[PDB]
Amino acid sequence: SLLNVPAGKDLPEDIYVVIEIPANADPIKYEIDKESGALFVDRFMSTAMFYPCNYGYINHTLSLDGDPVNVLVPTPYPLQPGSVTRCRPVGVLKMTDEAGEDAKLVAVPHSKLSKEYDHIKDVNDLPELLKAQIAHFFEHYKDLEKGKWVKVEGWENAEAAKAEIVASFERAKNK
Amino acid sequence: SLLNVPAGKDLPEDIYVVIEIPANADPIKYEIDKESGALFVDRFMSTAMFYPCNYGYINHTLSLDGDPVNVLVPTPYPLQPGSVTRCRPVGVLKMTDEAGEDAKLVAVPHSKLSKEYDHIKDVNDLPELLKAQIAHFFEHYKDLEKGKWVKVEGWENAEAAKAEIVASFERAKNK
Amino acid sequence: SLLNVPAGKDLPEDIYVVIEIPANADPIKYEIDKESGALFVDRFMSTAMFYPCNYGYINHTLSLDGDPVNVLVPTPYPLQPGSVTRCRPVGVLKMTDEAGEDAKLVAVPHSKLSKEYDHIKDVNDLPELLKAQIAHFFEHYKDLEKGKWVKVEGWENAEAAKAEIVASFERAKNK
Amino acid sequence: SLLNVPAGKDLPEDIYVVIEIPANADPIKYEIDKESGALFVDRFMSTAMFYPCNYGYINHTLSLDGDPVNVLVPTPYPLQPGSVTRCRPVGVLKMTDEAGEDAKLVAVPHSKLSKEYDHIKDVNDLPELLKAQIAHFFEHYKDLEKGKWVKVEGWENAEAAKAEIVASFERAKNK
Amino acid sequence: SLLNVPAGKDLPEDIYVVIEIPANADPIKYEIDKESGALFVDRFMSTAMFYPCNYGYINHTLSLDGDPVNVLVPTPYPLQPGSVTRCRPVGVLKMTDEAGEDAKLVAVPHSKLSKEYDHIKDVNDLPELLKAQIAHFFEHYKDLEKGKWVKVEGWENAEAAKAEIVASFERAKNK
Amino acid sequence: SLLNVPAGKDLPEDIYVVIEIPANADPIKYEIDKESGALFVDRFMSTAMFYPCNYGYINHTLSLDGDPVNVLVPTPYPLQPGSVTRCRPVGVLKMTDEAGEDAKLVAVPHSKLSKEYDHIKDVNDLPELLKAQIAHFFEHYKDLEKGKWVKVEGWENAEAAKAEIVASFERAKNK
């Protein structure tokens, strides 16, 4: 029951990300349906691009855009869809699309799971190649879709990311 | 909760297919257990064949054969097991086995998901190679199983497929 | 709902194993969270090893170590995570770690699913190469993890395995 | 070896394409070394894109960019690197990169290999999606490479492609 | 290159098999070009079947079908195309196709490579499943190919296989 | 062919590595046959381990173990067997096996191929995890092979690696 997974052990620095799409996956956009807790296909992108890292959501959050908060999680190996990963937020990729807000958080595995990300404390600590690859992916994977687009704005720090988690958690908690 | 996924947005022309087996999967027959909503292994086929396309079921349907209605869904890339795909029915592959009825519906992704199947309105619009590959797969994947077989009868149109969806939906709705 | 899957059709000789990790998977240790029925990432191992066979648990069991009873299931092809496989227990791999008991049961697909394991009645019937590969995997996959280790003790017969299933089933049934 | 392979059975209508990169390969750009007849790694691209179809060359040809003529070949399943495919040229994607000419022809498997492309006689017969995908891939796969770029001029017909095969074949012979 | 490889260390008991197609490969039939020593795509099969084991040839041999002797080789993991495996012939699958003779020998890896097949001394020692799978694959992989067919006469012993290796080896030498 | 490839552009700082085994490959140990220039299967390991990175050799070299110098090369994506990668040697893993010398150098892709390793100038610059993973893999992949063993003496610097490239290059020339 994905629907009974906690938002985190100690929000907002210690969170749980439920994986929707694994790293290196084909360009099929999936989305969690909170009514059923089932993953629905959104769209089969026409571009020849693959997901640069894992993509999931924080359960029990309500982003202003209506969906839970989405998170990009880089890992040693691709994660199983539906698995829950303990992470630590490090930044946010600010973007917009024809529909409005589309920011995505970036988080790294918690030290209990792996020791290789212990030194990534903020968005500026992530490899420059990884950040460029992620931003490029989002800017272009919808290129061949008519009436759809994505404008990538920039990166924001961990503090920005944490503000968003606590705000979205409360936005569903008290509502 | 696969069990809370609707049968469709607008039956029978607009349905939801819950994927059980992805396209190109190894010859392991899986089946949904409606008691638990969990996928159980049915049999490991001994033939060297792979699934020609995705295989799923329409939730909230009761085929006369006892199970939900099964659907074959061809896609640009293989779908994740347990994901829900919005489709449009285009035909049916009539078959029987030692146990009785074994017809399988064929449906294509809804236009909202992809624009490449918009021109496939009926079973006769599907590529002739695809239809031959699907029929051949079902006729032969159980070849090396003792006391089991499949006799493929032929293809029926979208109207036949739609009659089956509404009949099976009601057969579980009012029962 | 993995949580509603029966422990077995006829315990302890006829059981159901819910798959957590498929055969040949990368070294990411997953674990079932019985609160949510969701799979959580435990650890990303640093070794260059892969799972020699499928790894799952028997639902409705309570091993003394706190978790459900874990089972290793060898199959013709890798199983889908979350799928339920009907098996017959044939032995147990006795092991310990820094945390205590860590025995893992070994079971083969039930004859209804496949006929290739019908002649494996006990732990001594399994291929000698398979047993060595499994024991070696467990002895070494945690090698590069600080403060963690596994000491593989030896193999025990089907009778030992069956005693453990009935004991663990009752340990959760009457508690 | 791969240097004893003809440019074709009957240039320019009947050609042989030696595969260098399989369809769906990761973004590692390879280049044939004319002297060794060995495949050299040229560059690891930083974008998250995969090769939209098989990429190869016509042996015994020398295009303006100094390498043999390169050909993109669509197939049902990805081809093995180094295998030779009998094809029919159907068009060319005109482009220039930071170094000069960079045209890629497009050829389909010969009818003896598969009837599936028998109808593709010219550039306008190819699927619009595939053409969009190929152009988009070449337009952007080098986006994150400093100093590297690709200007896409557009598609040209079978006749333009056949003229390049003839000119390039003679350019390698009359040398 | 691959043309400087011996037919074997000690024909016909000790042979070398150059791999053309890996175990589990898609249904693309390849054929070695004797003059180039290059692998040519021969046909894309339309059936949904995969190669049951590694498929190769004995260099410096010429069977009746005009190609070198072909050998099927079972292994723990699929082999790389072009690699040379030291084997022991254990049998032959007698067949004829639309063109004439079409026998395939079966060889197991030599004891220096793996002890796992040391007990397989003859055709009757091979697993019944594997033999069933191989025959079924050759009986049906060309089912959807117009004008193409395969008549399977049956299995023959190691002696029959060794006689073909000797005759084919001499047929290429005394030419 | 692969025998017409230079040992390097400027030994020992600028070398070419011909790939034999891709990163993440199954435990099948291959060995280059100097006379054929063909890859021979040497042994199927029984341990459940995968190659931690690409494994190759420097053409026109002859190390003490009788084979050309072997090199481990880390890359963003696994390389194709037989492709040639321009590298920079950065260290050597000193080891001995049951037969004698068994050192493996470590080289990183040249800056023309990727900027990603430009900072790796010496052995101590490589990630500690990767080095741990490589040593652990060589220490244990032959554990289940009777009579086979590997003693790992430790890492050595770029200078030690360059001295071996020079000595091995001359040992093959002055022969």
Judge whether E48 is closer than 8 Å to chain D, CB to CB.
no
- Nearest CA to E82 among A106, A66, F96, F18? F18
* Burial class of residue E7, CB neighbours in 10 A (0-12, 13-18, 19+): buried
- Nearest CA to B86 among B19, B1, B14? B14
Residues of B in contact with C113 (CB under 8 A): 41-44
State the SS3 of chain D. CCCCCCCCCECCCEEEEEEEECCCCCCEEEEEECCCCEEEEEEECCCCECCCCEEEECCCCCCCCCCCCEEEECCCCCCCCCCEEEEEEEEEEEEEECCEECCEEEEEECCCCCHHHCCCCCHHHCCHHHHHHHHHHHHHCCCCCCCCCEEEEEEECHHHHHHHHHHHHHHHHCC
Whether residue A55 contacts residue A119, with contact meaning beta carbons closer than 8 Å, is answered with no
Structure tokens that stand for A92 in this block = 């946010």
Neighbours of chain E (3+ CB pairs under 8 A): B, D, F
Tokens 């799972």 locate to C51
A20 C-beta neighbours (distance < 10 Å), count: 23
Phi/psi of residue B2, each to 5°?
-60, -35
Judge whether A49 is closer than 8 Å to chain D, CB to CB.
yes
> Which residue of C2, C44, C144 is the best one to mutate when testing the A interface, meaning the one whose CB has the most A CBs within 10 A?
C44
Contact B50 E50 (CB under 8 A): yes
Tokens 């209990």 locate to A112
Tokens 């595939």 locate to D130
State the SS3 of F45-100. CCCCECCCCEEEECCCCCCCCCCCCEEEECCCCCCCCCCEEEEEEEEEEEEEECCE
Measured between alpha carbons, how far is residue D13 from residues D87, D89, D122, D127 in Å?
8, 7, 12, 21
The DSSP H or E segment spanning B85 is strand B84-97
Coil, strand or helix at F125: helix
Whether residue F79 contacts residue D28, with contact meaning beta carbons closer than 8 Å, is answered with yes
Dihedral angle computed from the Cα positions of residues A129, A130, A135 and A140, in that order, rounded to the nearest 10 degrees: 80
Q: Resolution of this entry in Å?
A: 2.1
Whether residue F73 contacts residue F116, with contact meaning beta carbons closer than 8 Å, is answered with no
Measured distance CA(F175)–CA(F171) in Å, rounded: 6
- Nearest CA to F74 among F101, F33, F114? F114
Chain B residue nearest residue E128, CA to CA: B46
Domain enclosing residue F110, as ranges: 1-175
Judge whether B38 is closer than 8 Å to chain A, CB to CB.
no
- Nearest CA to A18 among A38, A45, A35? A38
In angstroms, the first-to-last Cα distance of chain A is: 21
Measured distance CA(A92)–CA(C116) in Å, rounded: 52
Measured distance CA(F154)–CA(F134) in Å, rounded: 11
> Which residue of C32, C80, C87 is the best one to mutate when testing the B interface, meaning the one whose CB has the most B CBs within 10 A?
C80
Measured distance CA(F90)–CA(F16) in Å, rounded: 14
Judge whether B52 is closer than 8 Å to chain E, CB to CB.
yes
Q: What is the DSSP letter of E145?
A: S
Q: How far is D4 from chain E (nearest CA, A)?
A: 5
Q: What is the DSSP letter of A136?
A: H
Q: Given its phi and psi angles, is residue B172 left (phi above 0), alpha (psi -120 to 50 degrees) or beta?
A: alpha
Are chains B and A in contact at 3+ CB pairs closer than 8 Å?
Answer: yes
Are chains B and E in contact at 3+ CB pairs closer than 8 Å?
Answer: yes
Which member of D2, D113, D116 has the closest CB to residue E41?
Answer: D113
Q: What is the CATH number of the domain that holds F136?
A: 3.90.80.10
Method: X-ray
Judge whether E132 is closer than 8 Å to chain B, CB to CB.
yes
Judge whether A111 is closer than 8 Å to chain C, CB to CB.
no
Judge whether D1 is closer than 8 Å to chain E, CB to CB.
yes
- Nearest CA to D108 among D117, D99, D95, D98? D117
- Residues counted in chain A: 175
The DSSP H or E segment spanning F107 is strand F104-109
The dihedral through the CA atoms of C163, C164, C168, C171 has a sign that is positive
* Burial class of residue F11, CB neighbours in 10 A (0-12, 13-18, 19+): buried
Measured distance CA(A16)–CA(D144) in Å, rounded: 32
Parallel, antiparallel or unpaired: strands E84-97 and E15-21: antiparallel
Judge whether E144 is closer than 8 Å to chain B, CB to CB.
yes
Residues of B in contact with E129 (CB under 8 A): 46
Q: How far is B134 from chain E (nearest CA, A)?
A: 8
Contact F46 C129 (CB under 8 A): yes
Q: Give the residue ranges of DSSP H helices in C42-141.
A: 128-140
Whether residue D164 contacts residue D103, with contact meaning beta carbons closer than 8 Å, is answered with yes
Output the CA angle C103-C106-C110, nearest 5 degrees. 150
Q: How far is A41 from chain C (nearest CA, A)?
A: 19
Q: How many domains does chain D have?
A: 1
Residues of F in contact with D41 (CB under 8 A): 79, 83-86, 109, 113
Residues of D in contact with A144 (CB under 8 A): 132-133, 136
* Burial class of residue C5, CB neighbours in 10 A (0-12, 13-18, 19+): buried
Contact E136 B52 (CB under 8 A): no
Contact A84 C43 (CB under 8 A): no
Q: What is the DSSP letter of B80?
A: P
- Nearest CA to F37 among E2, B29, A7, B143? E2
Q: What is the DSSP letter of F117?
A: G
Residues of C in contact with A80 (CB under 8 A): 30, 39, 81
Judge whether B42 is closer than 8 Å to chain C, CB to CB.
yes
| Beta-ladder partners of D96 | D101, D151
- Nearest CA to A31 among E41, B86, F140? B86
Which member of F46, F48, F129 has the closest CB to residue C49?
Answer: F48
Structure tokens that stand for E29 in this block = 């039939």
Measured distance CA(F137)–CA(F150) in Å, rounded: 10
Measured distance CA(B43)–CA(B21) in Å, rounded: 13
